[PDB]
Each structure stands twice: as C-alpha cells, then as structure tokens.
Design a protein around this nucleic acid. Structure first.
Lengths: 94, 136, 176, 141, 38
RNA sequence: AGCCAGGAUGUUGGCUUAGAAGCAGCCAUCAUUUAAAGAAAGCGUAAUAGCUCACUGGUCGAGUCGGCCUGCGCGGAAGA
C-alpha cells in the first residue's frame, strides 16, 4: 500500500457528513501513539480499491497531512446499511 | 419448527420495522446472502432455504444461520369477526431490513456459494444479493 | 459502426457510372441496375468504394454500413448472380415452371399454381431441384421463403421443400 | 499400449462371462463370445497374477477374428505388490502406506518393458508414474 | 412449445434470440426446447 | 467478434459396484510435452465415433467483456 494524501476538516456531523459523502470524499480519523486525535477528509480514488486487499489491515500505511508524511495502521471500517458505500474509517498511529 | 419452549409473555405488539438493525458484516465464514429490502420472514421459509442449500453443497463445508424469529404472533384458526381477546400462537415471525445477512458459508467454492444462495433466495419473499468477507 | 470503412472491391467487368444520387451498373447477367445513394454519399476509385453521411441525413456511420452491402449485392447481381441451395424430397413429388406460373406437387389436391413477381425467372434442372434466377438478392430469397411455406417439411417422412444445410430436422422413431 | 481408439475393455473373469450389462453393447453383435475370450487369456493371467483376472482391450477383424492390445501386467496390478495399499489409495498423503520410492517405481516400470515404446528407461517412468498419480499414491520424497 | 414465464441458457447449442420485440428459444440440435416469450 | 486450423501423452486414469469410454456411486482436481488440450457443461446414443465446448494459434486490427455504482426505459401484464 503505497503513500496516500489527506486534508484537515473543521465542519462536521450529519449534514456535513452526507455533504462530504457526495460520491467524491470520505471522513477519516488518526488517533493513538501518545498524540491527540486528528480529523481528516479523504478523496475516494485509491482508498476504496486499497481496502479490497487484506494487506491493507495487516501492513502499515503512509499518509500525507499538511504536506508531511507519517506512519499509521487500519483499525475499524464503518459501512452503509442498504448500499455498498463507505461511511467512516479509523487509523491508529505507529 | 423454530420457536422457544418457555415464554414470559406470548401476547405482543405487532410493531413496525425501522430499516436499520445489526448486520452488514460477514463474520461466520467467507460468503453470504444479504436481505437488501424490507419484508416478513417465517420459520417455514428458513427451513425451505436450509433444504435448498443442502442440495447444492450436500455435506461440503459448514453453514451458519444468524437469523431466528423475532416475536410470537397471534392468529385465529378460521376466517372470523374480530373481538373477545387475541387468538393463539402457532408460528413466530420476524421483520427483516436491508443490512441483515441471513446465511453464511466458508468451506466451499465462491461460484457454488453464489449458486446455492440463488437456489435458497427462490424460497424468500424479496430480491436478495450476494456478499463477501470484505477482508475485515 | 465499423463496416462503412470497408473498400468493398469490384471486378473489372463493371464500369460503375454515377450522377448525384443515381448509380448506373451493368454486366453479363443481362441486367442494367439504377440504384440510389439518397440518404448517404459514396465515392468511387475505379476498383474501391468509400461511404459517408449526407447533409440533413442521419449522423454517424450506421446507415452507411448498410448501403455497402446492397451495392456489393448488385455488383454481384449484374455480373454472375447467386447459386442454388433449394431442394425437394419425396418420390412422385415434382417442381415445374410454366412461364411466369410455378407448380409444386406434394401429394395434395392442387399443385400450388402460383404466379411470379416482377424481375425473377424459375428453373428446374431435375424435378427435385429449384433454381431462382435474377440480379436482386432479396426477390430470389423471398420467393423461396414463400414457396417453402406450402404444407411445410414433415417430421418423420422428411418430405417437402428443404435447404442444403448440415442441420437435420427429420426426426427418428421411438420404441413403445 | 499403442493405437487405442474406439476399443472396449473387459476383465477375463468367468463370473463376468454370463451377465451382459458390464459388457459394451455391440461386442456380441460384433461377433465375440465372452467365455472364449476368458479362456484365450487364462494361462497368460496365471503366469503374472494368482486369483485376479486381468482387464484386457479387444480388437476385431473379418471372420469374427479377435486380437488383444494387452499382453503385459497392468501398472495398477504391479503397484498393489509394490506399496502397502489394499486395492488403492484415493486421496494423496492421508495414509502411511500411500507413498512409493522413485527407485522401486522405475524398478516395476521394467517389469512392463514389453509394453514400453519410449526406447529409454526414463521414458518407462513417464509411462507408469501417471497410474500412481491416478491412484492417490505419492511419488515425491 | 410452451411459454412458461422465464428462459434458461442450459446448453451451448442454444444462444437465445430477440426478434420483432419478442425473445425466443431455438436449438438446432433439439426442437424439444423451442420456447416463446421471456 | 467473425472466417480459417488444431483440441495430445502417461491413460484402457484410480477405486467402488449395480453399471461403461467427463457425461447412474466415489477420489485427485496430477504431471510432462506444447502456442494448446477437463475425468468437465449440453447433446449423441444400445454404445462407440463425433459435434456443440474448455484451451491455444493464424487472419484482421484498436479497443472489448462480466460484475458493480448511478440516471432513464421495454416485454413479462386476462373479466364481464
């Protein structure tokens, strides 16, 4: 799983969640590793095709935020109840 | 077929279905069948679907069914004017919603699991769709 | 829509005359055909053809993809035409040609006694062979399809009018 | 063997010389008697195996005159004397008798050398190893 | 013949054909399997 | 895609039986040769042969297919 990019978000909850999930972006979070939680928005292009392979959850991932790159691992995956759609995702620090 | 042997109460609210509930994730095996709509489920339909999968996979693999009837429901034995209390329970019923995974399999080929769930889906009142382990 | 690209190719035995929508073609099959390029436009290069769409007519290369086949079928139609494939089976059954009237005997009350369309000849080189003669690929196939329809092929007997084809519709008997 | 196309196989057993269903449905119409067939290979059976009648492939010419494509011991009959198997092995690597050494495999291959066409002792192995793979018998160490 | 209400693609000699608004079964190896509608 | 040409070898695969040559029970889903070739889908049938195939190649020539997402349809579709 080669390096992916993300952007910081400030607007949140229900209407902002559904307006982010407009067939273009997803919400995500980065937490743990003795640092504070960070809220981010992710473009739909690579991440969905990456979570097709089991190595996405058993090997670490490199993410770019504010131009700087850090190591994380996948932890949890929230899905839509009546369509094949991604609702929210968790990452843990390394 | 398929009901408990002891009950605290048998006279119950029929109620409505919220369209949500628990489900979506496959966790007894590698392949399954998902409800993908609203409707009504009985024990005779579950047994007719069990009897269908055992013709496709025979003795191969293990087969898990995370679903069981939700409530007792009262009925009266002949066509009748209502009144003088509720009738009696001869069957239980469940309301199902789109995220519910009904059946799960593992020790079998994918093209056989999909074919067996197609044969079982013919016993059910609604259109249903094939689901995978999604690696997580 | 790929077939409008095709060169088609013509034999030396055709001169291919053209004026606007009207194409004039003749050859040693006794025919002088005048065929139309009305909804599409064709260009000739003495041996090869190219088709394309007209102003105020259907866009793309689809209606042009049909026009090549009909012009090829008429270049063939005026030079040598099309070969035999219709047959009859049954003893005492007979095909015959009485000028513009045709006859077909199938063990029945009357021998069809039907009259031919315009621009077609019939021929019977033996009483169980049927040949249709002309330049239009359509009429020589349409009249065979109207003729085969009389009583239709019998299942176990095999008797009636048939085509030269490797498939068998004649059925075999079963034990009781 | 060689040139085996459109040919029937039958066991030279006298117990199979009366019931017609185990026989190819045209072989009797094609002019063959099943007990004359069983007799014509009895001393050829006795001289390679005791109690087991051989499976043989048959061919027919004019004046009902029949001939065989078989005269050597079958690979499956040689293997039952070479490994601890009772009659076969079915599934690979499930039973402790379900293996043979390549050295003994190329040894029994030469017991069938009168039905080997490959003109090479490695081409004898290439023409018996398939029966071991078919029988669920392991040929790798 | 029959129509029933649905068609299956059970052999390789069957291809299934839609003509003049209707779908039909034809099988050049076996006329037993002619069917209309689908 | 069509048109054209092939579709082996161990092997008569192994077992079990009532029964046999994918194709009336059961087992492996083997290996080498090769550009390629299953103990399999539907026929053939008393069967075999063989086709319709899996699987590759030539020819031609730049896009092509199953599933899925998302907008919009058709036939399925009878009554006094």
């Amino acid at each position: 799983m080669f390096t992916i990019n993300a952007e910081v978000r400030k607007e949140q909850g229900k209407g902002a969640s559904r307006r982010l999930r407009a067939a273009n972006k997803f919400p995500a979070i980065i937490y743990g590793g003795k640092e504070a939680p960070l809220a981010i928005e992710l473009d739909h292009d690579k991440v969905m095709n990456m979570q097709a392979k089991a190595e996405f959850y058993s090997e670490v991932l490199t993410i770019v935020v504010d131009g700087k790159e850090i190591k994380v691992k996948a932890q949890d995956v929230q899905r839509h109840p009546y369509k094949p759609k991604l609702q929210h995702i968790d990452f843990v620090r390394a | 077929m398929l009901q408990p042997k002891r009950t605290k109460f048998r006279k119950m609210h029929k109620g409505r279905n919220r369209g949500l509930a628990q489900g979506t994730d496959v966790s007894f095996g590698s392949f399954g069948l998902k409800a993908v709509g609203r409707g009504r489920l009985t024990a005779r339909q579950i047994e007719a679907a069990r009897r269908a999968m055992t013709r496709a996979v025979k003795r191969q693999g293990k087969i898990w069914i995370r679903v069981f009837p939700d409530k007792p429901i009262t009925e009266k034995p002949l066509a009748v004017r209502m009144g003088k209390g509720k009738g009696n329970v001869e069957y239980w019923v469940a309301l199902i919603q789109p995220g519910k995974v009904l059946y799960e399999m593992d020790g079998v080929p994918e093209e056989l699991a999909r074919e067996a769930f197609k044969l079982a889906a013919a016993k059910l009142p609604i259109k249903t769709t094939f689901v995978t382990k999604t690696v997580m | 829509s790929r077939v409008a690209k095709a060169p088609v190719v013509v034999p030396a035995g055709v001169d291919v005359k053209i004026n606007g929508q009207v194409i004039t073609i003749k050859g040693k099959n006794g025919e002088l055909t005048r065929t139309l390029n009305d909804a599409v436009e064709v260009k000739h290069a003495d041996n090869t053809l190219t088709f394309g769409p007209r102003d105020g007519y259907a866009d793309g290369w689809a209606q042009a993809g049909t026009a090549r086949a009909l012009l090829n079928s008429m270049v063939i139609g005026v030079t040598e035409g099309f070969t035999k494939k219709l047959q009859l089976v049954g003893v005492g059954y007979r095909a015959a040609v009485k000028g513009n009237v045709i006859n077909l005997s199938l063990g029945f009350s009357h021998p069809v006694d039907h009259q031919l369309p315009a621009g077609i000849t019939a021929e019977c080189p033996t009483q169980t062979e049927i040949v249709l003669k002309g330049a239009d690929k359509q009429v020589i196939g349409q009249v065979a399809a109207d003729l085969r329809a009389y009583r239709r092929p019998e299942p176990y007997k095999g008797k009636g009018v048939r085509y030269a084809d490797e498939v068998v519709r004649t059925k075999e008997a079963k034990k009781k | 063997a060689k040139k085996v196309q459109a040919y029937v196989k039958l066991q030279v057993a006298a117990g199979m010389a009366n019931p017609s269903p185990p026989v190819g449905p045209a072989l009797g119409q094609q002019g063959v008697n099943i007990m004359e067939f069983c007799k014509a290979f009895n001393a050829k059976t006795d001289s390679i195996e005791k109690g087991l009648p051989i499976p043989v492939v048959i061919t027919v010419y004019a004046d009902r005159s029949f001939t065989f494509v078989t005269k050597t011991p079958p690979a499956a009959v040689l293997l039952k004397k070479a490994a601890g198997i009772k009659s076969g092995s079915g599934k690979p690597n499930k039973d402790k008798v379900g293996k043979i050494s390549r050295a003994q495999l190329q040894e029994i291959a030469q017991t069938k050398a009168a039905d080997m066409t490959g003109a090479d002792i490695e081409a004898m192995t290439r023409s018996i190893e398939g029966t071991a793979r078919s029988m669920g018998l392991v040929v790798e160490d | 013949m029959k129509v029933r209400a649905s068609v299956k693609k059970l052999c390789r000699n069957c291809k299934i054909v839609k003509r003049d608004g209707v779908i039909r079964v034809i099988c050049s190896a076996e006329p037993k399997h002619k069917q209309r509608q689908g």
